Every structure is written in C-alpha cells, then in structure tokens.
Design a protein around this ligand. Structure first.
Ligand SMILES: CC(=O)c1cc(-c2ccccc2S(C)(=O)=O)c2cc(Oc3ccccc3)ccn12
Length: 116
C-alpha cells in the first residue's frame, strides 16, 4: 500500500530469458502448427470460433517491440496459443498432439527458469 514497499523479484533478465524460451519453442520439431497465424482464409471456422488468435511469430514481434509489460503477460500469450489449439483441434490429431507436447515443453522451461 501507499509508501509500504513489498519486496520484488529481480526482473532485469526477464526479456532475455523469455526470448531464449521463445527461441527454444520456435525450433522444437513440433512447433510447425504454431509458427505463423492460423490462416483465416483457408481454415474454415477459425475466425468465428477463436476470439483471440495467437502464434509464435506474433509473440516474437510483441516481445521484440516492447508490447509485454511483464513476464506474466508473455506467458498468458504462450498459453493462449495452446488453449486455442485445444479448442479447435481433437487431442488425437497431429496438431492437437503437437499442442499438448509444446505446452508441456513450455511449462517445464517456465518453471525451471522463473521458479527459483
Ligand atoms: C494451430 C492450428 O489450429 C492450426 C495450425 C495450422 C497449420 C498447420 C500446418 C501448416 C500451417 C498451418 S497455419 C498456422 O498456417 O494455419 C492449421 C491448419 C488447419 O486447417 C487446415 C489443415 C490442412 C489444410 C488446410 C487447412 C487448422 C488448424 N491449424
């Protein structure tokens, strides 16, 4: 509260660390469904069903241009990729499996990087 400062984590390396995580994501063999925005002209349903599309190229651009206020906003966009993937794709399909794999990959890096 006013004039009562809470201790806060050192956030100075967050940008570099999130960039590194995103690079690891981008180069994963199963990243292929997530590299570019879902093609709204070619993918019937997508536009209407998925209210907030997100993908790794969009996140990279946002990260490179100061559009994440903090590391949590970054993680929210990463998780949004995988949440959209699950909404739109069967768990059993190649894309749905890829999404599950990439979510797991991401969360382990997230915990290992930012949870002490
Ligand atoms: C993430 C997702 O739901 C998704 C991703 C693609 C896709 C897959 C392969 C290459 C490129 C893309 S993208 C990001 O350019 O859309 C995809 C494709 C979908 O429908 C198809 C599938 C085959 C042919 C045409 C459209 C549906 C969902 N996604």
């Amino acid at each position: 509260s006013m004039s009562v400062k809470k201790p806060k984590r050192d956030d100075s390396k967050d940008l570099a660390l999130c960039s590194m995580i995103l690079t690891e994501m981008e180069t994963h063999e199963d990243a292929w469904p997530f590299l570019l925005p879902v093609n709204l002209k070619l993918v019937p349903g997508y536009k209407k069903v998925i209210k907030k599309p997100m993908d790794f190229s969009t996140i990279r651009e946002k990260l490179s241009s100061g559009q994440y206020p903090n590391l949590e906003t970054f993680a929210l966009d990463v998780r949004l990729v995988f949440d959209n993937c699950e909404t739109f794709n069967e768990d059993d399909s190649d894309i749905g499996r890829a999404g599950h794999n990439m979510r797991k990959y991401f969360e382990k890096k997230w915990t290992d990087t930012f949870k002490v």
